[PDB]
CSV table of C-alpha atoms in Angstrom, one decimal:
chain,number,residue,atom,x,y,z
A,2,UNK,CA,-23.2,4.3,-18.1
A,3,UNK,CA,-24.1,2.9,-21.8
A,4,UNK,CA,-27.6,4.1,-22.7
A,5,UNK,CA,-26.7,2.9,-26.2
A,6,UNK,CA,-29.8,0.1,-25.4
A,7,UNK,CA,-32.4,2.6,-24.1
A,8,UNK,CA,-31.2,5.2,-27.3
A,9,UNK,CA,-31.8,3.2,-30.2
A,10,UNK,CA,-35.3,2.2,-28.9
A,11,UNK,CA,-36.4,5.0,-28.0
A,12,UNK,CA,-35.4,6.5,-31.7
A,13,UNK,CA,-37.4,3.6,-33.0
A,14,UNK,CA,-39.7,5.5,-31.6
A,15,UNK,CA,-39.3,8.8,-32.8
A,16,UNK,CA,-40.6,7.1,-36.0
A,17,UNK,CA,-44.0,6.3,-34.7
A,18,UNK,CA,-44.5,9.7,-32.3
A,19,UNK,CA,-46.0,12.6,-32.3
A,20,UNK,CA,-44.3,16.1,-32.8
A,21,UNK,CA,-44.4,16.9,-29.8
A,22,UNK,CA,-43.9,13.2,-28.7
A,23,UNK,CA,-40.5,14.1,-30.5
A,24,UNK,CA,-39.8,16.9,-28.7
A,25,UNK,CA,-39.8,15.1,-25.6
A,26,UNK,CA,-37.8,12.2,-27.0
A,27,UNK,CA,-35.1,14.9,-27.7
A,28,UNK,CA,-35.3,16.5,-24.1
A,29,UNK,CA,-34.7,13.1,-22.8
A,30,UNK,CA,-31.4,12.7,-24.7
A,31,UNK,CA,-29.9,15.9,-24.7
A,32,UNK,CA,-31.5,17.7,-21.5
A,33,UNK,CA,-31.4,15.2,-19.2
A,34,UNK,CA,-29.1,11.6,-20.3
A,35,UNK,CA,-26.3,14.2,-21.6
A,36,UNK,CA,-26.5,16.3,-18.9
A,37,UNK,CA,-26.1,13.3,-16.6
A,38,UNK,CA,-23.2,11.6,-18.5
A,39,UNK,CA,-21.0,14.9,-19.3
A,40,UNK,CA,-22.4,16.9,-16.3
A,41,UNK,CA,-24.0,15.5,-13.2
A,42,UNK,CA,-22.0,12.7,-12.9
A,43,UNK,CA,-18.6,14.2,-12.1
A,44,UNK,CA,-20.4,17.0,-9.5
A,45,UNK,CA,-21.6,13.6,-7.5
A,46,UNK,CA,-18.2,11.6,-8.2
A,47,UNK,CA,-16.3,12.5,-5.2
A,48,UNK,CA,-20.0,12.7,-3.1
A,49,UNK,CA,-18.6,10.5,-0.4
A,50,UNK,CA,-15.2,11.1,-0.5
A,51,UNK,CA,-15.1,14.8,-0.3
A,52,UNK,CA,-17.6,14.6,2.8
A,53,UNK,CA,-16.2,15.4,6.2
A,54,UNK,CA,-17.3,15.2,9.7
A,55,UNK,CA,-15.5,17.0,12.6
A,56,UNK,CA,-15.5,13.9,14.8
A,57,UNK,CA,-12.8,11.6,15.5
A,58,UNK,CA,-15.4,8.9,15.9
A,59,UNK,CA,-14.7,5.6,13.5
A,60,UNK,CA,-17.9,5.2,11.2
A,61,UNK,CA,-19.8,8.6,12.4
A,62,UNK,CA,-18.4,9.7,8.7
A,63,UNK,CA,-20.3,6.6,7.4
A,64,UNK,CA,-23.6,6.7,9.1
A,65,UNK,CA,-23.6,10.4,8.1
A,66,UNK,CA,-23.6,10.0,4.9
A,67,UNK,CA,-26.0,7.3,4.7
A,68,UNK,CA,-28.6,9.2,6.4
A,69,UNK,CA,-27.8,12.7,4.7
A,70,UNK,CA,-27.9,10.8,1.4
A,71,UNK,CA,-30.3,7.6,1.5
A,72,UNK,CA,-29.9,7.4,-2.7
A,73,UNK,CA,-27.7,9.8,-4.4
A,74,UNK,CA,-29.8,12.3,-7.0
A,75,UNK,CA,-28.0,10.8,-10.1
A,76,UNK,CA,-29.0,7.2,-9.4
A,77,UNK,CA,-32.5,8.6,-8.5
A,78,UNK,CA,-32.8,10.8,-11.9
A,79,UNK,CA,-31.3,7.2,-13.3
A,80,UNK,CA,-34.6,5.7,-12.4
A,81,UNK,CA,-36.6,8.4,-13.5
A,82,UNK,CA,-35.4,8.8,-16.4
A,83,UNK,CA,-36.1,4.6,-17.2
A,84,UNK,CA,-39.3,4.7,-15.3
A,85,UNK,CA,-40.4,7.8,-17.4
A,86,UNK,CA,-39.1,6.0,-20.8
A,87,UNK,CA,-40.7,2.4,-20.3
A,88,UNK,CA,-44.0,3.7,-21.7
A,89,UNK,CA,-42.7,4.9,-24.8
A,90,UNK,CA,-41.2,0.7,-25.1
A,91,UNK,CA,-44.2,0.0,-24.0
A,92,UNK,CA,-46.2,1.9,-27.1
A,93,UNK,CA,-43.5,1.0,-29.5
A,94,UNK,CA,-43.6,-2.9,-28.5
A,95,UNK,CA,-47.7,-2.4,-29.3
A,96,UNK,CA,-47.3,-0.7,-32.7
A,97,UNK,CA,-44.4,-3.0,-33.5
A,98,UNK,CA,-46.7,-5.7,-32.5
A,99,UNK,CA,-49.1,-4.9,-34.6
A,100,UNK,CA,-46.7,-4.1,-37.9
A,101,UNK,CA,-45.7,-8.0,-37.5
A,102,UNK,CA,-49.4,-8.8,-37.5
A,103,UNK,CA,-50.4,-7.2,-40.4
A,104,UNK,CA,-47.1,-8.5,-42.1
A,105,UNK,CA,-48.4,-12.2,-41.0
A,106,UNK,CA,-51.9,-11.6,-42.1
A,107,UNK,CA,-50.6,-10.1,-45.7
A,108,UNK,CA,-48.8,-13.4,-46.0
A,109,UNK,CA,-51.9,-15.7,-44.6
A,149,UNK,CA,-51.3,5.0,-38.0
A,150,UNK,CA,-51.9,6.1,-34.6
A,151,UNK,CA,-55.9,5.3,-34.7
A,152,UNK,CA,-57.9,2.9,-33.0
A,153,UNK,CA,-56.2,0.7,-30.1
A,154,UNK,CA,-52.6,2.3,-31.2
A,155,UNK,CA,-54.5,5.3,-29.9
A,156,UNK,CA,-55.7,4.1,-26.2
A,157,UNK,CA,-52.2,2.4,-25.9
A,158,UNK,CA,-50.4,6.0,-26.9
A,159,UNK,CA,-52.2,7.9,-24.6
A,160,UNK,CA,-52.5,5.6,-21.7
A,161,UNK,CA,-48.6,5.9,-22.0
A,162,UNK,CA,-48.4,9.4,-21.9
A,163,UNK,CA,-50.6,9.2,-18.5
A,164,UNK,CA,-48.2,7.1,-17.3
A,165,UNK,CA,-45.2,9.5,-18.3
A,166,UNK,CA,-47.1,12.1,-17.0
A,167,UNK,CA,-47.4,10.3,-13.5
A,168,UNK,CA,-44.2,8.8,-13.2
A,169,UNK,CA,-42.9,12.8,-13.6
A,170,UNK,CA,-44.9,13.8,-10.7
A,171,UNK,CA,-43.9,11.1,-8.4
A,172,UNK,CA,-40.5,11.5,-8.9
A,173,UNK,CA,-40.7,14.9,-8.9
A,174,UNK,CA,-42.8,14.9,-5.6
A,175,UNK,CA,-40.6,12.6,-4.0
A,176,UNK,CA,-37.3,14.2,-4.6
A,177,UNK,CA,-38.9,17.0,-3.0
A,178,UNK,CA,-39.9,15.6,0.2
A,179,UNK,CA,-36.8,13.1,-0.1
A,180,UNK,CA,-34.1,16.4,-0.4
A,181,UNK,CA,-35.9,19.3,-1.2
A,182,UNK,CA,-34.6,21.5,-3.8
A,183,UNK,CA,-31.8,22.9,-2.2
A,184,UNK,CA,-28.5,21.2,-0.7
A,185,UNK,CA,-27.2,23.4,2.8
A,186,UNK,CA,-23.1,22.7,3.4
A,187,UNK,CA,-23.8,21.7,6.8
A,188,UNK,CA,-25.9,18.3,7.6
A,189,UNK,CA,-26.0,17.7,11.4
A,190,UNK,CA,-26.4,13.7,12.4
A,191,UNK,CA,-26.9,12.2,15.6
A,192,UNK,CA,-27.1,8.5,14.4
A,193,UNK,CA,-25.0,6.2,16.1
A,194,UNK,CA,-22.0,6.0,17.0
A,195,UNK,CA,-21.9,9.7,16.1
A,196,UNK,CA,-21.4,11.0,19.8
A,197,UNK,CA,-24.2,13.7,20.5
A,198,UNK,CA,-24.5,15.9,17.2
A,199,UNK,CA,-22.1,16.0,14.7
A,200,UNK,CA,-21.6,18.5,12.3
A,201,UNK,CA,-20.8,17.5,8.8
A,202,UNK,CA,-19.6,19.7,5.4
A,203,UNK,CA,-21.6,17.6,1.9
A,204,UNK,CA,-19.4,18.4,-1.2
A,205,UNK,CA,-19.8,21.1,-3.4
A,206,UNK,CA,-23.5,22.0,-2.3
A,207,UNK,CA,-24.0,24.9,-4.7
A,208,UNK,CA,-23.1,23.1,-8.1
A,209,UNK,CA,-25.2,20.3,-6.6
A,210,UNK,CA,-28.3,23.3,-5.9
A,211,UNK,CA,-28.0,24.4,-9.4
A,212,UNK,CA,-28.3,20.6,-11.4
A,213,UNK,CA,-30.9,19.7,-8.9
A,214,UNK,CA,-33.0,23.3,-10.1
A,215,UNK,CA,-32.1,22.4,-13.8
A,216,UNK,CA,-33.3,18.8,-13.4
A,217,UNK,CA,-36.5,19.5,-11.5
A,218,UNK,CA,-37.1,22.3,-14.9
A,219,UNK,CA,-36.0,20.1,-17.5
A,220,UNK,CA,-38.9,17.6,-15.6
A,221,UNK,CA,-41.4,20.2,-15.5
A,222,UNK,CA,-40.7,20.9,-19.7
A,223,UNK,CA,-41.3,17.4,-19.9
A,224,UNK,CA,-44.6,17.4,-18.3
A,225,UNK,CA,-45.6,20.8,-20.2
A,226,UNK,CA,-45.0,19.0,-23.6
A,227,UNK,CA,-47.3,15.5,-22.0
A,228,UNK,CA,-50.2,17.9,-21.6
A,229,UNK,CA,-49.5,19.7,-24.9
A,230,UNK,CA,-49.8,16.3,-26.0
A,231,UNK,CA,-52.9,15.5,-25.2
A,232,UNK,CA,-54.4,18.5,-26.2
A,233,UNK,CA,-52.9,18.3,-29.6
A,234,UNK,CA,-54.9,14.9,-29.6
A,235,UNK,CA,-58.0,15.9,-27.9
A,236,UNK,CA,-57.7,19.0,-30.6
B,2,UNK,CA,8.0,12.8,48.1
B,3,UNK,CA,9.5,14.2,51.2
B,4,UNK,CA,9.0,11.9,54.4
B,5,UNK,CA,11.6,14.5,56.4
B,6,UNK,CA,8.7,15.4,59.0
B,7,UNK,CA,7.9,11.7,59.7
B,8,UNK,CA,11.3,10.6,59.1
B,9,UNK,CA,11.9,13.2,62.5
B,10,UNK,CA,9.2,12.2,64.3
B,11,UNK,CA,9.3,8.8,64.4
B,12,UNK,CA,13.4,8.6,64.9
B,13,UNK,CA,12.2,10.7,67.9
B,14,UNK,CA,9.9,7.3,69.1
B,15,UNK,CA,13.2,5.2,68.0
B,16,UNK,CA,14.7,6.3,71.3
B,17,UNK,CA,11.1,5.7,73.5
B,18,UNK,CA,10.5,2.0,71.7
B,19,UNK,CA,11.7,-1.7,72.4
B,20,UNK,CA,14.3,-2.8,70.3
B,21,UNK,CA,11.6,-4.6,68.1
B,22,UNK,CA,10.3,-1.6,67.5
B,23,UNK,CA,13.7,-0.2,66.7
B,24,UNK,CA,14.0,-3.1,64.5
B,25,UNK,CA,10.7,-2.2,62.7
B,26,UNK,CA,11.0,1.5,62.4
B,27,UNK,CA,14.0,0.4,60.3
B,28,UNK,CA,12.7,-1.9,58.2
B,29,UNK,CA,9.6,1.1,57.6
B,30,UNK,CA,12.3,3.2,56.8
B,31,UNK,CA,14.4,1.5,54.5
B,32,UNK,CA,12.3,-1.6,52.8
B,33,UNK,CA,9.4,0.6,52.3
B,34,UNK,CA,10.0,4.4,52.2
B,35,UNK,CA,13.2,3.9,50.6
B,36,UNK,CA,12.3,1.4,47.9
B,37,UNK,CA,9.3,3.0,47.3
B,38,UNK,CA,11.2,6.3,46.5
B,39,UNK,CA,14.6,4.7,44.8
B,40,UNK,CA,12.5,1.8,42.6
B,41,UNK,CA,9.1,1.5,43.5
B,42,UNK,CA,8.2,5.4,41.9
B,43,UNK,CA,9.8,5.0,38.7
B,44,UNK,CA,8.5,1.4,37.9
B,45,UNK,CA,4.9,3.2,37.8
B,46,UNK,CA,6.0,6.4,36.5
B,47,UNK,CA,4.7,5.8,33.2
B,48,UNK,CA,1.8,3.1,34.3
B,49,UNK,CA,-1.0,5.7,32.0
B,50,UNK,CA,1.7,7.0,29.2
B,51,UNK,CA,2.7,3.1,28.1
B,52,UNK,CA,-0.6,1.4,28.8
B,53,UNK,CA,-1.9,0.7,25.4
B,54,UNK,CA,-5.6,-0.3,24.2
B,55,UNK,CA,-6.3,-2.1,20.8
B,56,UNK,CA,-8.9,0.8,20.0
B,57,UNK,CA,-9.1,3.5,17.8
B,58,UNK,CA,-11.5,5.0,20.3
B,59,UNK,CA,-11.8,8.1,21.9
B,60,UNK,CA,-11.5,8.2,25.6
B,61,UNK,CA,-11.3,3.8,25.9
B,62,UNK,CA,-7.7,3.8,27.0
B,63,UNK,CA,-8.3,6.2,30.0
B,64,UNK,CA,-11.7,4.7,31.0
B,65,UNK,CA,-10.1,1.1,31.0
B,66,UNK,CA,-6.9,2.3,32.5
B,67,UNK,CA,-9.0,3.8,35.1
B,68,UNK,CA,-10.7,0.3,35.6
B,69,UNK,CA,-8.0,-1.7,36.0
B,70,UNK,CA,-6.0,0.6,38.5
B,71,UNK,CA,-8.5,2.4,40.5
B,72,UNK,CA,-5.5,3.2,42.6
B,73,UNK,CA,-1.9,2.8,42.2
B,74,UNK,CA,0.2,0.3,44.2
B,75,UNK,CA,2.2,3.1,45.0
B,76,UNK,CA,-0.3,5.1,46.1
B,77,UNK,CA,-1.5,2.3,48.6
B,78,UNK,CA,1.8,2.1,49.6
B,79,UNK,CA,1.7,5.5,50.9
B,80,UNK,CA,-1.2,5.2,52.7
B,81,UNK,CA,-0.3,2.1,54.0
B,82,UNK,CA,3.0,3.3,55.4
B,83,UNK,CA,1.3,6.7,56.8
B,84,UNK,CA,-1.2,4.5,58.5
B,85,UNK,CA,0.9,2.0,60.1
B,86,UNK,CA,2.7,5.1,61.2
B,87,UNK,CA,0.2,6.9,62.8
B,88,UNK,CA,-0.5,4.7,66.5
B,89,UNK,CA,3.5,5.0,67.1
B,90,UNK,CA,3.0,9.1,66.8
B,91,UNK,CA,0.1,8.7,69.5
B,92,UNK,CA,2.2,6.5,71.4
B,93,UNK,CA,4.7,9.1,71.3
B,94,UNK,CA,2.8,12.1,71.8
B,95,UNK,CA,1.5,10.1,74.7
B,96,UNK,CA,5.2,9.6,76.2
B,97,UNK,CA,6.6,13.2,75.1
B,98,UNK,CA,3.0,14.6,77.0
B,99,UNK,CA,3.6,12.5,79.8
B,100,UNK,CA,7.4,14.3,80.0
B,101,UNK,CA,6.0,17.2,80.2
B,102,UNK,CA,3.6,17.0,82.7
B,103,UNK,CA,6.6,15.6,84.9
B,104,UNK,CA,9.2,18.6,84.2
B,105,UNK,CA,5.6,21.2,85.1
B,106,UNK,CA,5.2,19.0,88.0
B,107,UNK,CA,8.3,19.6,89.1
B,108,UNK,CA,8.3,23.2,88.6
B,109,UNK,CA,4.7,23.0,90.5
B,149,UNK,CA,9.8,3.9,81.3
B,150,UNK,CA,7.5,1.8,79.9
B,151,UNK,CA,4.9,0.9,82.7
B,152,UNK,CA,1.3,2.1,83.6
B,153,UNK,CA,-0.7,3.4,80.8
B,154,UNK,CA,2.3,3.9,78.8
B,155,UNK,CA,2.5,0.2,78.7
B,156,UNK,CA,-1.3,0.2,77.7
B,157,UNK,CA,-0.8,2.9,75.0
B,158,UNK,CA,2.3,1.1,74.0
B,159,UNK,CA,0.4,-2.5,73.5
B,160,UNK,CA,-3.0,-0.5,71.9
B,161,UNK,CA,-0.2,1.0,69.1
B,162,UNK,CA,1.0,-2.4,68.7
B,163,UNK,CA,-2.3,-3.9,67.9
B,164,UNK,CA,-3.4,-0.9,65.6
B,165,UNK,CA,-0.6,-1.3,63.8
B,166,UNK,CA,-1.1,-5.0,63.1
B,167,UNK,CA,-4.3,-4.5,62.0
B,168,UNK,CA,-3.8,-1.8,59.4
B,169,UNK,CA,-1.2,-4.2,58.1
B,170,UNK,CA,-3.6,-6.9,57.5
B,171,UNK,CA,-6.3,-4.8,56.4
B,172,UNK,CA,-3.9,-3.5,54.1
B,173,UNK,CA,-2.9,-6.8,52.5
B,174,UNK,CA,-6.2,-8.0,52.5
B,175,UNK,CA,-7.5,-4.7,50.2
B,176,UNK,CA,-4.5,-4.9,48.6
B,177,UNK,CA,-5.4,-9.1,47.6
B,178,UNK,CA,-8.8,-8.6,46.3
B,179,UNK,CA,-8.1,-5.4,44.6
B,180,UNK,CA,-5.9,-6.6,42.6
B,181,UNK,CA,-4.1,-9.8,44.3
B,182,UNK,CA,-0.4,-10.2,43.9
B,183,UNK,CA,0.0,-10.8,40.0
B,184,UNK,CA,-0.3,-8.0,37.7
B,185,UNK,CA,-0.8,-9.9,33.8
B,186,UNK,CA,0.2,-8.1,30.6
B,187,UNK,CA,-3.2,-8.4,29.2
B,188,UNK,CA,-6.6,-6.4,30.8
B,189,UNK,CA,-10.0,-7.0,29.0
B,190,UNK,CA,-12.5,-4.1,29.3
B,191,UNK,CA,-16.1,-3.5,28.0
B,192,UNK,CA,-16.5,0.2,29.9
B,193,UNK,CA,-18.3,2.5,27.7
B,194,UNK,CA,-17.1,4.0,25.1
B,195,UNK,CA,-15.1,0.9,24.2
B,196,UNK,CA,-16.6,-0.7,21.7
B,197,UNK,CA,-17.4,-4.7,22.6
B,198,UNK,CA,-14.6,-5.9,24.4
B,199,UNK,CA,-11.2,-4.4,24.1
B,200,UNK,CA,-7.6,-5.7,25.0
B,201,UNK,CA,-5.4,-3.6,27.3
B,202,UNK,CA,-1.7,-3.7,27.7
B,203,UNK,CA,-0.3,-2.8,30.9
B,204,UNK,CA,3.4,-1.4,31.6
B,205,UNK,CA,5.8,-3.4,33.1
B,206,UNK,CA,3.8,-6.1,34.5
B,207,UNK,CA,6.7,-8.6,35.7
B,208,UNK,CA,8.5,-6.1,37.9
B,209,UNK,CA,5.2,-4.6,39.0
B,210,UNK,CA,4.6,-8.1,39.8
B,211,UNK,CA,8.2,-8.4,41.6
B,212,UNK,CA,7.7,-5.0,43.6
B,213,UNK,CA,4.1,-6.4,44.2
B,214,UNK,CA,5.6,-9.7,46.1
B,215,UNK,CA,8.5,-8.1,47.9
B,216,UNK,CA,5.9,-5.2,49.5
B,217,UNK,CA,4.0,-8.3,50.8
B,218,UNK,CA,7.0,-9.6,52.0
B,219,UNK,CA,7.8,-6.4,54.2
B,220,UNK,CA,4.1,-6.1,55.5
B,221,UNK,CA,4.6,-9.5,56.6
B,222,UNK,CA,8.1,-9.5,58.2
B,223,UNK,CA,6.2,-6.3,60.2
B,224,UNK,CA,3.6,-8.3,61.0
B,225,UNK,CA,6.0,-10.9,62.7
B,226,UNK,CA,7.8,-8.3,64.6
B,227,UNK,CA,4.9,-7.1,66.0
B,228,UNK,CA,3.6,-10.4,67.0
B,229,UNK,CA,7.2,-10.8,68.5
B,230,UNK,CA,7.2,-7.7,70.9
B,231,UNK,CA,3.4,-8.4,71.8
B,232,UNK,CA,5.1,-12.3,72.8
B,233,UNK,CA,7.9,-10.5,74.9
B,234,UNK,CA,6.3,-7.9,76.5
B,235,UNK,CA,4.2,-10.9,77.7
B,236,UNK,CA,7.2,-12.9,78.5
């Protein structure tokens, strides 16, 4: 995975942000795209692999899987992670925007409609957050058990399956729902630092 | 398989019977018993072990061995000769009852309702024959093919089946119809000279 795109606009827009609007741009890269590349991403590697069912039934195994896991948590804190950081590009594309124009207009900061626009983007951080956050819970909870029972077909009756390495897994899906709750924490210090 | 107690029984209506049925008790006793026990047996000895299904699931082979052969030949061949055994030992048990009555009697062959007994053995004997081949034809006819296709749950779709030694099954198959009907003959042949 090359965030190497995603990084260097998003420190563009460490320029044009807040304090606290850096903060969170620094949470982003170190708490939760370093944790994913150098961490998370070798707990989930052998996810599939290392899971066993005690059936000799050809593609219980699969099925079992599928349904246990409908989208692994690293492709879903993927998504999050653009979703949360497409109102920043958003903002930045703006502000941009609006350097170009002035530049034009010469040849023919955060006040006015930069503000709306920066603000209206941290709502939207701020929601995207929750609705991840909110749907990992009712997708998984926070907690992965060892044992996942299926009775999807052509599993005969209930199955019993063993998921790889559930406690590691327990303790990145805690850190990841925190470092997302930090997150929110510093949006709303945002926009009382604004408001104040 | 030990036939000793019929073996004894029916040399004892050997001595009581036309020389037809002298001429069939032989042919029972050694183109049927003693094929069945010196060939016959060990052709089907391993008619579950070798039969193979193109499956790699669970309990397919015995379900679709169990639906191709819902009873061995040899097994039918059994009842079959116990069967078309049984009216001679009323026959005889007739006679020996009949001798005696006449030794008590005197302390106090084949005429009158021995002859009666002796022609009602004769037709219950044909007729087991030819129920016999007729179960045995639409059971399973007189061919046995390498190849058996079966959908019986759990077999996935349809699966292909390979049966043990299908040729001399086959062989055994035609020469056991052979005897049944040679039997058949002689019996029409003492009903005809009885008559005549």
């Amino acid at each position: 995975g090359d965030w190497s795109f995603l990084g260097n606009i998003l420190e563009e827009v460490n320029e044009h942000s807040t304090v606290i609007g850096r903060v969170w741009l620094t949470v982003l890269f170190i708490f939760r795209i370093l944790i994913l590349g150098t961490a998370a991403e070798f707990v989930w590697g052998d996810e599939q692999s290392d899971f066993v069912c005690n059936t000799q039934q050809p593609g219980c195994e699969n099925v079992c899987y599928d349904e246990a896991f409908p989208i692994s948590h690293i492709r879903l804190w993927v998504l999050q992670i653009i979703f949360v950081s497409t109102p920043s590009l958003v903002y930045v594309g703006h502000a941009v925007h609006h350097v170009r124009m002035e530049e034009k207009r010469k040849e023919r900061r955060l006040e006015g409609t930069l503000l709306r626009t920066y603000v209206c983007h941290i709502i939207f951080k701020t929601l995207f957050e929750v609705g991840f956050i909110v749907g990992h819970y009712f997708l998984y909870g926070f907690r992965i058990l060892p044992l996942y029972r299926c009775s999807r077909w052509p599993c005969p009756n209930v199955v019993d399956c063993f998921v790889s390495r559930p406690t590691e897994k327990t303790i990145f899906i805690l850190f990841m729902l925190s470092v997302a709750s930090v997150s929110l924490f510093l949006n709303i210090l945002e926009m009382s630092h604004l408001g104040l």
